[PDB]
Ligand binder design. Structure first.
Ligand SMILES: CP(=O)(O)N[C@@H]1[C@@H](O)[C@H](O)[C@@H](COP(=O)(O)O)O[C@@H]1O
Ligand SMILES: CP(=O)(O)N[C@@H]1[C@@H](O)[C@H](O)[C@@H](COP(=O)(O)O)O[C@@H]1O
Ligand SMILES: [Zn+2]
Ligand SMILES: [Zn+2]
Lengths: 382, 382
């Protein structure tokens, strides 16, 4: 057992000074004044570093030089484990491996792989995020059109039956029957609107059917016009809908992120939507059946189409603070508590309180990771 | 002097019950509990109606069957007087006659006619609103393209010399040297961004140069995309910028109006941008050298291009309350206090307080005008 001391502790609700977090049995035992700490307990000094619950990334296609996409070879438990070690280097202790628009078979393997993974590693990769294939071609983005299709009773049923390892499914509401959304949500899956050209009216129908989240706000959505707010405008106008936003300063202009934060409040979540280049050093990689190039901080195919990002959660936190005028504590919530509540895991993750899983990360004022703790174990030490 | 009693009185800061507004010498003498009323003063009952500062419309091309545009014949003091009488019928006691993209000749005539009207009618038509001709053809809307032109140093200097009768000039910041903006602003003229295809970057440059207002948000502006917020996006992100919004449910979707209000706070002003059909009953009229038809409840030229509205201020107040979820008191401010502050006339108008000009309007809960008072005289009685 041990206690982390001498550092600013962010519980999710406030910053504490002169306190210590005692971690025992992979769980956070308590957070209280350092002066009430029993004697001889090994104290781990944070050395002034900020201590926060581990970041939670709800949209991640790949990182650490690998992708959990495209092939049966890459859609494996080993990939999941690799992506986890890479995330940890960036303070990210949890994520939703995201498998995009692909064949029925690859989706089934992804489900089997997720399930196998869960049995071996708890409180890490939390569950699958299936982005596709029920999208709108007009907003397919970098997805392979040969796989963008309409929903079948068989696939729909398979997902619902495997809801226990499927955290979320992103789909275009105007491309699927309301019944499909309701069925998925009733099974326990978070249904999110994304890669849609839906009008505001269509978007609202999707919300009423069971959609409670939206994938990477602005991206793969209609632009906003005076008379047609579209899905983006609808999400902004609907206080109950949570949503992710890629904060790399490349996918979305910081001004739109600021406007989005003001309008979404505690419902805006930080996501990386990263790819293999994130937390690694590579020049190119494969994605959506194409060759993607990492040229100038961008991940684009030969046609210049953005294909995911190379952003890490700690970099996202930093950008939101330095460029979007959002307080550190609020930014930390966008990367922890908010995404945790969006996917229903706040009872065990998202804050530094007694009983919660011991997943944390520590960084210095310059936003450099000094520690990362998974299930009470310090996997990163810098 | 006399007193208005028996009604809910909105001062611009609060709703008052059991109070009275005492009017003397065209000014509001006091707003106090009915118990402090001077002995034996005349008491005019509001019959339970709501009493408010008279509505101020900062963008109006025409109404009552006339237009303050297009021809040397129409640009007259008589038109201004006709428009004022029609406005009063819908609770609007003050407005800015808006002369759009036309020739140097007509503009100068507009300046002379305004000056002539001002020496004759105090506290009514406040001053000129020149919308154009330094706009972007991409966003000319219904404006005659043949007149959209670059800013001549001479014309600019002229406007500066006649700043005393020119309340506002709307221009596209990316089509004009920063100096033109600065000259006009320093001359006391409110410089507004409108009919522009400005990027967020070009818009901010405009604000730094002197722009403090934006004409009919969303309309004649770029749509909003993830990586290019454009002028509309920059306006929503800059708290210091005031802007008008056409609340007819026709020019801008109510969801966009709600998002804009949450982002602009006390900087969002209600405007009509109405034309001749407002407060009248016509099937067509001339505007921008074209025949405009009132089809399907819209003012459109033969090509379907929206060409102004047929909204009245009292109808706009109603729409904002019923379809935008904005409290009546806040909506009233959008039609009074806010626009008054935007054009710097709040020391004499915009609120019901001692010393302020006695311009007021009263209406029943169903938004029907019962009274309109200008300089202390009740000009509308219903
Ligand atoms: C794995 P993914 O989520 O599909 N990645 C998206 C791409 O498909 C889009 O092309 C890009 C731009 O979208 P845009 O609408 O052009 O802003 O945004 C994301 O990078
Ligand atoms: C007197 P005005 O201010 O010129 N009137 C504008 C028109 O020119 C535009 O065509 C219309 C639509 O603009 P839009 O960009 O299509 O929303 O909005 C206003 O009616
Ligand atoms: Zn996507
Ligand atoms: Zn206009």
């Amino acid at each position: 057992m041990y206690a982390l001391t001498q550092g600013r502790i962010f519980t999710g609700h406030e910053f504490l000074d002169d306190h210590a977090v005692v971690i025992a049995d992979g769980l956070i035992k308590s957070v209280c004044p350092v002066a009430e700490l029993p004697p001889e307990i090994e104290q781990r000094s944070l050395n002034g570093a900020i201590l926060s619950p581990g970041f939670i990334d709800v949209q991640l296609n790949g990182c650490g030089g690998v992708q959990f996409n495209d092939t049966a070879e890459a859609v494996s438990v080993e990939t999941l484990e690799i992506m986890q070690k890479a995330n940890e280097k960036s303070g990210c202790t949890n994520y939703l491996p995201t498998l995009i628009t692909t064949s029925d078979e690859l989706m089934k393997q992804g489900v089997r792989v997720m399930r196998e993974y869960l049995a071996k590693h708890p409180n890490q990769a939390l569950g699958l995020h299936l982005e596709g294939p029920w999208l709108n071609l007009v907003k397919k983005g970098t997805h392979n059109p040969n796989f963008v299709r309409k929903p079948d009773a068989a696939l729909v049923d398979f997902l619902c039956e495997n809801a226990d390892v499927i955290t979320k499914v992103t789909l275009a509401p105007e491309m699927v029957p309301a019944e499909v959304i309701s069925k998925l949500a009733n099974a326990g899956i978070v249904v999110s609107a994304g890669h849609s050209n839906a009008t505001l009216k269509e978007a609202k129908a999707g919300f009423r059917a069971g959609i409670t989240f939206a994938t990477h706000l602005y991206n793969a959505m209609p632009y906003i016009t005076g008379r047609e707010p579209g899905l983006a405008g609808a999400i902004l106008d609907e206080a109950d809908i949570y949503c992710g936003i890629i904060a790399d300063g490349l996918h979305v202009d910081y001004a739109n992120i600021r406007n989005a934060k003001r309008l979404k409040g505690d419902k805006l979540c930080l996501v990386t939507n990263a790819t293999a280049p994130a937390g690694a050093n590579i020049e190119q990689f494969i994605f959506a059946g194409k060759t993607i190039y990492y040229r100038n901080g961008l991940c684009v195919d030969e046609n210049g189409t953005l294909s995911g990002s190379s952003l890490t959660m700690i970099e996202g936190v930093r950008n939101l603070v330095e460029h979007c005028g959002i307080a550190l504590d609020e930014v930390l919530r966008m990367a922890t508590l908010y995404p945790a509540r969006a996917i229903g895991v706040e009872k065990r993750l998202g804050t530094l309180a007694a009983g919660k899983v011991a997943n944390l990360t520590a960084f210095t004022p310059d936003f450099k990771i000094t520690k990362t703790i998974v299930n009470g174990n310090e996997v990163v030490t810098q």
